[model samples]
Target chain A: DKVTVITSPSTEELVSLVNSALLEEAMLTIFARCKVHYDGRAKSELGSGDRVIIVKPDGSFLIHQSKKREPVNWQPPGSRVRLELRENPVLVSIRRKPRETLEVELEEVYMVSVFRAEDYSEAEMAELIFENPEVIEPGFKPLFREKAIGTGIVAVLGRDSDGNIVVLELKRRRAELHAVRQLKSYVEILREEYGDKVRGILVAPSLTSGAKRLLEKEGLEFRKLEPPK
Target chain B: KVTVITSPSTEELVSLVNSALLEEAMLTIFARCKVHYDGRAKSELGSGDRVIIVKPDGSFLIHQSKKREPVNWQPPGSRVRLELRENPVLVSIRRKPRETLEVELEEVYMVSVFRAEDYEMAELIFENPEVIEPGFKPLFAVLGRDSDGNIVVLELKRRRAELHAVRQLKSYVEILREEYGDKVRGILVAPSLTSGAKRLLEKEGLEFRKLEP
Candidate 1:
């Protein structure tokens, strides 16, 4: 794990490092006080103020004000962003398809941090199962943790309430639409081997509305698993 | 480095805590146990596996499965008593303000203790930033006053404004409205708007100011 923090970084270095991190699929956080202007879909101005800018690996950009959970401005993935080093300040220009453009001129630079994250959710859940297999289902017993079936690995291989073989796909956070597709593929593979006795279940803290609808449509099951308090 | 112990005997636990205290390392205990909390609130959790985190500062928490928040906790500087009674071993944790959490551990599946490193990152300070001069900058496209001298919150979008932008402008409008009340107005400054965004803005009583980029 590596962490780099630069205070009042030069415009060129800031641009170089941020772009490097973006290319490397690392998370970047830039905190600064800046003036914002929009020219494409609308015309507006935000006077110089403190804001937190986040650039995710997926190329999404977010501008957040202090004390707010939501971003003040954002561009979803697929927006094109360009950085320009001017005479005094650095300018960030973002353009979305069909003419939405945003320009931010950084009047002051506060801090820039680039780091990698280690996700422990899956590991934690795996250990939790070994402690109590019944948490997933009342009578469920874990046959194996991280069972490899073909190219995919099932999070937990277990028996259901009726002692039927079941494959569990575990997600620490909310299960999204993609999770539904993942569970479906695993279930399909298991069905070929175990026939109608095999079942597929997705376990997560919660399920997105889209995932919930898709889960029912796919004939899969879901179980809510909260993080240990 | 981390050390993992499964189903340690009572003598082993006492040795572990004493060693952790000497090393000042944080400890976490996960067990299938029963809990009784007595303090401002009295509650009992049935015998089940739960996670307990004990910090080097003497704070501790009891977390049950399938819940986000802790079922019971004790702040730092609390007194910890580990009773190695036969059959059902007990851990008594108490603190000031009359809070006590007693855990009767029937079986411990795992316990992990490790040292946490102290990490620090430097904070940056911005300089010579232009202050909002009660007017407009190219960055802040324009600022205008209404007939009643109320400040108008204008949000700009370059292409088709989506629901996200509408929400963004709504927040700016709300902040201004809180400060200026009826004296503050909101207008969406965009070249075009999605049908859904237009409907949402109208429903929120926000006006739209069309612009061509």
Candidate 2:
């Protein structure tokens, strides 16, 4: 469905329409400056600021702070939502099954939108490496991209030389210290599943000196990939 | 004809299932109930009021009150089996290679059958490739041509066009001068510019234009 963008809508109008759409099972994306408080599994609070809230049809909710892609607090599917607009400040309460709840009190709403989205699937970076295996390593064969390992997902599951199982962690940008830690987490999981035969490799355009040192200390290998001309 | 069934009988549900298969229409079931899912992972949601969406393509999603993601969902093209027993109503959903999601609905709230249609949002492309290079496309910057046929570089900031933005525009201007020669003119556009940025732009001899969002 076409996105219906409402700019500076009245509190009454916004509340009425949002409630109507929610009942009909519609996806909503709201961008507003408001104070947020979350209580469930963990407790935290955010002062009044610009944030993006995405409500999917299945009752999943995500709250994203401005300038960052990832949401600050998110609830998985199967949540119950309640809205109280008659109060001094509009209150939005989201409750998950069991004992998780997120509450938001809006001081002012900049914009709110209701829309349906077509899923956009991007070609995985590991799939790109799989297509051209020779770019990073010659004998590496990719078994699967986004291979699920426990609760976490591996960027690439492949076989290295000597037929050893290799877990590859790919970073499109420069590899930093965090990238090394991420690869280490996957390596630890793979070790539990496949024993010591599993090898860990980090691939990126470039690696910082600290990341290189960490990788060396951890016995993890790094492959530098030059951007395709 | 649209069918609205409330607290459907066992035989009535069977008849609805037959009609659904025969007519190829999607069925939507909303019930106040409890749900349990066991597959690649295991999660159990207690009894509550929720919406159960079933598509004609054999896909289904179970949603509770306020969450965005489904409590449990089977992707498109799964096998569905509906069982109506005296003790409790049940629906078994199965997918290939070891995945089974079972839904036990307590009270049937509302059931409606209708055809599902797909709609896409209008594509909004904000960038004009002819006016600016793809690499330098930011929210506030664009390239244009003047009435004299000379290339003009327009840099805009919606809120406060700070000093960093001015420096950023200067860099772009330098690049444009190198590429398109001295005929390229840089214009700093914003609702309000920082004093430092305004002075710097003036010292650099760039023009300024005021615009607000």
Candidate 3:
């Protein structure tokens, strides 16, 4: 499940949800009628109303009120968030660098939605292929993944079905001309010891028209890979 | 539901507001007034025709109808009291934050009292489950199943229901259907439904029941 939402939750339940989500480092959006007491650059008490409280995975904290686009109160990234539940629920955010604290005491919560933020990455794609090298080619056994090759890391080092060493470079999205060059460099590094038995394979979801021309011209191969849904 | 009076005198305005506050209803007053706000940052609004709203939550707002923000306001849970003034009245609002907003009227144009019921409507629905429909029975937070053993889930919108509201209900219904392996139902609660909402809801075999705030 990517997201979970609860409405009009009790103090204990809200605290539990927050703590568990914090462990997962999920982004939190809480809509509630609350009071804010800030002890930071200047001290002030923001009285109760319907407002949105956002705690980002990056440790940023914000409290947005009803009328304006900007947050009424906020802390930059790296602030700490803690839940304090009593007869009522209180959320505390602390920033140690400047030593500031903001406490939100909730009167009634309308909704609390927690979701994780994700983005596809080259490293992740490499892991997926390494787990099942056969997805790339039959009987292709992977030896090293993210293997160090001089300064640049090769995506995968595997032996193909015909017992030839294969150097791989991967991209989660589209690959361009630079990808062909990168694969050739790794193959050349291995070709020094393995000689002509070394082959270069470009693993990508797509390749630009120019990149495909360059790949074929350089004697490299391209195999398309679609990420998991 | 609202009640409005025009060309109000000080006593007339004061009497209406006193009863309005006693009943915890929302109040609207239009007048030529001057406003002063203290704390949360100071602001002073000079003589002008302004609309002042006093929400049942004890918040006070003064607006000129030109922007998103109310020219001056006191947060919810603030105390509001009124008194007689020049040609009309004045309002003094205060909160625990030690902030104050005072508005003095030069001429009274209109005053109204509205039933601001929706702020706590969700809790009300829980208290009086029968209000939604006679056969409706709630299992504390929700029914999960209706009286006749038909599945039911609730989705509420504070304003008029729209296609987006219907979409959310459809999404939740689909999720439940996968688990229960049967027909699940979504009942959207709102004051009214838009044309697109009605079209989508019927096509999806879903339903909506009106509940005004």
Can you write out model 1's per-residue Cα lDDT over B117-182, one digit (the tens) per residue? 321000100111122123322212234555445576666667557788778777777877777776
Instruction: State in Å the error of residue B153, model 3.
Output: 23
lDDT digits (tens) for residues B86-164 of candidate 2? 3244454554655656666666644544432321000111343322333333232666666566777776666545577
Among the numbered candidates, top lDDT falls to 3
Docking class of 2: incorrect
Q: Write the per-residue lDDT of candidate 3 for residues B1-213, one digit (tens) a residue.
A: 445566776778888798778987667666667665545556655577666767677767665523334567777777788855333445455646676666778766666655533226667777787777777666541435577776787888876565786888888888878876466688888865655678899999778887877
Worst 10 residues of 1 chain B by lDDT: B120-129
TM-score of 2: 0.33
lDDT of 1 at B65: 34
Say which candidate scores most in DockQ: 2
Between candidates 1 and 2, the one scoring higher on TM-score is 2
Q: Candidate 1 at residue A86, lDDT?
A: 67
TM-score computed on alpha carbons, candidate 3: 0.30
TM-score of chain B of each: 0.52, 0.51, 0.55
